[PDB]
Amino acid sequence: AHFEKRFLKRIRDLGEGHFGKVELCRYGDNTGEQVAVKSLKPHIADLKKEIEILRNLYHENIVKYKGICTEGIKLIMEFLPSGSLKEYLPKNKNKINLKQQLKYAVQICKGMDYLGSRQYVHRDLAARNVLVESEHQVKIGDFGLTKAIETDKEYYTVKDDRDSPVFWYAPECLMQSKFYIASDVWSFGVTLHELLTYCDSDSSPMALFLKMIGPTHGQMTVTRLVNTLKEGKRLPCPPNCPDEVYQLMRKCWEFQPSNRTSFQNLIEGFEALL
Amino acid sequence: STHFRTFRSQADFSSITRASSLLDACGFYWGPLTVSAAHEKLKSEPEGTFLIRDSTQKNCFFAISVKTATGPTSIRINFQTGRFSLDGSKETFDCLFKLLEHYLSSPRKVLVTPLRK
Ligand SMILES: Nc1ncnc2c1ncn2[C@@H]1O[C@H](COP(=O)(O)OP(=O)(O)O)[C@@H](O)[C@H]1O
Ligand SMILES: [Mg+2]
Ligand SMILES: [Mg+2]
């Protein structure tokens, strides 16, 4: 489980996140398979925590852990060629129909429900972090912000002083930094909105919420986002999205965490439509 | 522009909504004014005319824009655990308007008259 830095290929780059960079490598015979290596891209203590989380997870709809490259530390994992839904959906708009989207929504819920069974809250469930293995299979990655809820507690309060994808976050996360399992359910409804809009930039969660908010900048954007959610305003029904699917999407956006649906009820909801 | 910091506590969120509520009451709060837009409104005002607006930085809430001898400038309002403080000062206040009422009596005499809408 220990890869040597002297045999890494460093082919090209795969994708850049808000916290790190991912590159494609292989490890003169070229007998090594393709692997995705995640570097720090300036911190060092957070990447070690992310590796310990990924090595603890083992699910069909979660990116498989591979190894570690010492020096600094680099994370090695399986390489999914189709990238993320943020890149796969805009390129296959006429290929992925509604039934295939609902199939993706079921796989994401089964992966998130398993993640919740291990007291883990993802805290960054978005289409850019849902990797695509094939046309019929997707996996969940990016656990840099994942936190573990204590077995006797119902949520985990964050004192990280780090940036957060606020346009995917529930009101309790924005106002108090509290993260329930229901907080990931909120993020799923936003991610489901991305999946149905094929990750269109003009219909992104940020662009639509900024339209509802109006002129804003700075950290006061968070304040105005909370006030917009307090007014009962949510992302609209995507075009060509049936009412039965949008109702399940609205169940994820209840202001109260206790009023939101669970992942197991979402699986039963989407499976009833297939 | 994608990521921000969530509020660290309900008390912190109550502090900012309390300040935003008081700022909407006064006439010299302009909300989402940029640095260039605020300085254009202040360059022709008498020296010492100040203004309250939202900061443009991700990690800051409010900022003050005043006209000094060299023209319109801007100062950050640091917020930490319900306390407000200026970027170049060590005086903390539990209220934003107590911070303003203090520097209206400061020996520096930087702020004197507010620019109303
Ligand atoms: N194993 C992988 N296979 C294919 N693409 C990947 C893989 N890992 C990461 N990526 C790409 O890298 C991008 C960002 O990776 P991620 O680790 O989520 O960033 P960060 O965690 O720094 O925010 C994603 O959009 C994804 O497309
Ligand atoms: Mg990411
Ligand atoms: Mg990340």
From TrEMBL, chain B:
UniProtKB keywords: Cytoplasmic vesicle, Growth regulation, Nucleus, SH2 domain, Signal transduction inhibitor, Ubl conjugation pathway
A GO biological process held by the record: negative regulation of CD8-positive, alpha-beta T cell differentiation
Signal peptide: none
Domain SH2: 28-117
GO molecular function: cytokine receptor binding; insulin-like growth factor receptor binding; kinase inhibitor activity; protein kinase binding
Pathway named in the protein's UniProt entry: Protein modification; protein ubiquitination
Domain of life, per lineage: Eukaryota
Ranges in a coiled coil: none
Main location class: cytoplasm
Role played: Essential negative regulator of type I and type II interferon (IFN) signaling, as well as that of other cytokines, including IL2, IL4, IL6 and leukemia inhibitory factor (LIF). Downregulates cytokine signaling by inhibiting the JAK/STAT signaling pathway. Acts by binding to JAK proteins and to IFNGR1 and inhibiting their kinase activity. In vitro, suppresses Tec protein-tyrosine activity. Regulates IFN-gamma (IFNG)-mediated sensory neuron survival.
Family: Belongs to the SOCS1 family.
Record-given protein name: Suppressor of cytokine signaling 1
Organism: Gallus gallus
Gene: SOCS1
Segment of the intact protein contained: 48 to 164 of 207
